[PDB]
């Protein structure tokens, strides 16, 4: 939008980066993909313990809009991973990444943060919510055939690490 909005977004994103590095949450490595564009971040996240994702690490692209924080970033796993709350194409579909299906909260607002988004994604990996799932095939498999769900996730992890 406006030049002012862009200025504010860059200032805010610098503060977000500082906070994330300072807090240093376990299993998360994220920052601007290049030094001349703070609006695109590259992320690598360790799969949470005691889940099918545990032995894996997962790459994602975090893209911020020019009027951040009045709009949420888009987060896309690249390549896509199987999960009830991740679209087949890799886009993550959780409340914190949407502006005001299926109500309650917490949705995106300027009082949320990148660290909070990344923490929410980790929680999502540990606790899928099929009732608001974006990948129905993943939802059905999780509900009905957990063994097959886990076999598919684990095979993909093995392949991602060169096995």
């Amino acid at each position: 939008g406006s030049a002012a909005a862009s200025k504010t977004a860059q200032k805010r994103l610098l503060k977000e980066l500082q906070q994330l590095i300072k807090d240093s949450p376990p299993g998360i490595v994220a920052g601007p993909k290049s030094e001349n564009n703070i609006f695109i971040w590259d992320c690598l996240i360790q799969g949470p313990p005691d889940t099918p994702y545990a032995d894996g690490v997962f790459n994602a692209k975090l893209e911020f809009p020019k009027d951040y924080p009045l709009s949420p970033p888009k987060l896309t796993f690249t390549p896509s991973i199987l999960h009830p709350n991740i679209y087949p194409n890799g886009e993550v579909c959780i409340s914190i990444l949407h502006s005001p299906y299926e109500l309650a909260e917490e949705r995106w607002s300027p009082v949320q943060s990148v660290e909070k988004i990344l923490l929410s994604v980790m929680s999502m990996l540990s606790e899928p919510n099929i009732e608001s799932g974006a990948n129905i095939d993943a939802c059905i498999l999780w509900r009905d055939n957990r063994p097959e769900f886990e076999r598919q996730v684990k095979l993909s992890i093995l392949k991602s690490l060169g096995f």
């Binding site: 490595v29 360790q46 032995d55 690490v57 076999r151 093995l158 991602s160 060169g162």
Partner: protein
């Protein structure tokens, strides 16, 4: 493939490194390397894991 994407050599050794000492880019490489090494070990004892590759 993560090792190709993050330029981690198949035979690389990062056994002495801690995340606190590394910049962001090297932290990603370490995370991938540790994941690979941890799976290599698991794979040699876990028949169910081996079955997935056949």
């Amino acid at each position: 493939m993560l090792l190709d994407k993050f330029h981690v050599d198949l035979n690389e050794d990062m056994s002495n490194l801690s995340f606190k000492d590394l910049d962001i880019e090297e932290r990603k490489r370490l995370l991938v390397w540790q994941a690979r090494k941890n799976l290599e070990t698991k794979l040699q004892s876990d028949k169910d894991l081996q079955s997935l590759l056949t």
